[PDB]
């Protein structure tokens, strides 16, 4: 029932499962040591992350984990994407082997480095811009691979030992050319506070709906891991989005970067910047920083 | 989005004092609260309650499921072995679904906490009987739970077993829902073969789940199909694989589990038959 793909298959006896990285809703992720995984360096144990099902897994949990594996095969290598390293798909549970990011998700990373008195090492304004630029490059790459993430948010970004930002969690990602999928998708399982109005109301997913999400990701970054639409329950966001409600400027944010967020949140999707435009604009801001 | 007001279930927000979170869920949050007017007979009286609500990262489906859960609980009458709806805050704010507090939490953790390195055989039979009575009542209210398991049973300060988590429960008369259900969101290890392969949900699919619940109880919160990943259960169920007898279990109670797991749904006992058979075992025990 699981697909065979010999070029991605990693032998189970070379994989040593270690500490769980969090107890998980639709699966479990565990630290592991993989010995041959780097073909250049056989006999060398690489620390990896292994996504697998839990005991109380649903049919949909297995579907989603297979889809996530296949979506990662279809997406090329990029510096700012969590890349597939391998899979165990035969004579046992499904293991999807991905790059370990030692510093965890970006939400927790930002929150851990907050200055005191909002209610370890601090991030500079330049660091937050570097972060945003890196993620813009990741999404420009994804858009070019015909991939809509649909679940872009700080909690779905991972940070490596070298502070490289990596887009992760491709379980909800779809090919923009998947007509049949988009024609029948009923009730959304995308966090409402990160959804483009057209995605929320009309079930329209494009790279431009990902750009809206990127704007919320920017807001998350410049609030040092704040929660969007603070004090507004999801229940009331529906009505507020239709009336053109938008978030206000974070503390760690210039008017320039806040106007970019506002552009990301244009009512008309084609009037939002492309990721390509976001990479160029952010590059210019990063080089003009003047610490 | 906006909910209609059902005046008989509406509770005013200013009478509800949210307290300690009882654990962050996957599709929502449950919090302890004090509700003062909640019992209409006793207006002055502060009742400790549980409040189900959305999280900040809530999906459209999370809101749907919380509304459905509230509506399903309205249809179900009061019963000692069911978590009952007490009220809802549905207007000018986030949806609060107010339910009976069970101080000792879910049955899985309760049993695991009392494992030898506290429960008698009679206690485990009492547990099973109580839950059989709960499900007999639900079946009679035209409710299919679909997600019967130890983690969806709550234990009160007085060790009363209460069936909980009606989020996935459906009315047998909900044909529109059953006609279009795509990929299941029900834990595979508790699903009747007909529910898993054919998307057929009946009281008899709940009876299969009850059998797994029995196995969970008599293993003191064990994990079903031990060492068998969900991935390989699909094939094993088609070949008629069934779990073996727990240590703390009589041949009688194990044969009842096996009956609950009959291949043919109509050949599985009804909850009514399970209540009568378990009553007899409870009175003949000790
Ligand atoms: N490749 C990887 N390297 C390091 N940490 C990773 C990782 N992939 C995931 N993680 C982290 O492991 C933890 C797993 O927690 P959990 O299993 O509850 O997932 P989650 O909280 O992200 C819910 P979901 O992924 O279903 O949206 C998270 O902190 C996640 O960011
Ligand atoms: N009415 C109630 N009284 C007391 N405890 C309750 C309760 N309803 C839920 N709980 C407990 O609160 C905790 C929060 O978990 P929650 O109810 O969100 O489910 P869960 O964490 O098992 C995953 P799921 O969302 O799928 O149920 C659990 O320990 C649960 O058993
Ligand atoms: Mg995530
Ligand atoms: Mg539960």
Number of domains of chain A: 2
Considering the protein shown, what is the CATH homologous superfamily of the largest domain in chain A? Transferase(Phosphotransferase) domain 1
Q: Which CATH first-tier class of the largest domain in chain A would you pick? A: Mainly Alpha
H/E series of chain A = EEEHEEHHEEEEHHHHHH
Identify the quaternary structure here: homodimer
What are the salient characteristics of this protein?
Phosphorylase Kinase, domain 1; Transferase(Phosphotransferase), domain 1; two-stranded antiparallel sheet; alpha+beta; binds magnesium ion; homodimer
Structure description:
- Chain A: It is found in: Cell membrane; Golgi apparatus; Cytoplasmic vesicle.
- Chain A: Belongs to the protein kinase superfamily. Tyr protein kinase family. Fibroblast growth factor receptor subfamily.
- Chain A: This is Fibroblast growth factor receptor 2.
- Chain A is an alpha+beta fold and 291 residues long.
- Chain A folds into two domains: 88 residues, Phosphorylase Kinase, domain 1, CATH 3.30.200.20; 179 residues, Transferase(Phosphotransferase) domain 1 (Transferase(Phosphotransferase), domain 1).
- Chain A has nine helices and nine strands.
- A five-stranded antiparallel beta sheet of chain A has the order 1-2-3-5-4, with helices on one face.
- The radius of gyration of chain A is 19 Å and the shape is globular.
- Chains A and B meet through α1 and α7 of A and α1 and α7 of B.
- The structure holds phosphomethylphosphonic acid adenylate ester (ACP) (2 copies) and magnesium ion (2 copies).
- The site of one phosphomethylphosphonic acid adenylate ester has 19 residues of chain B, from β1 and β5.
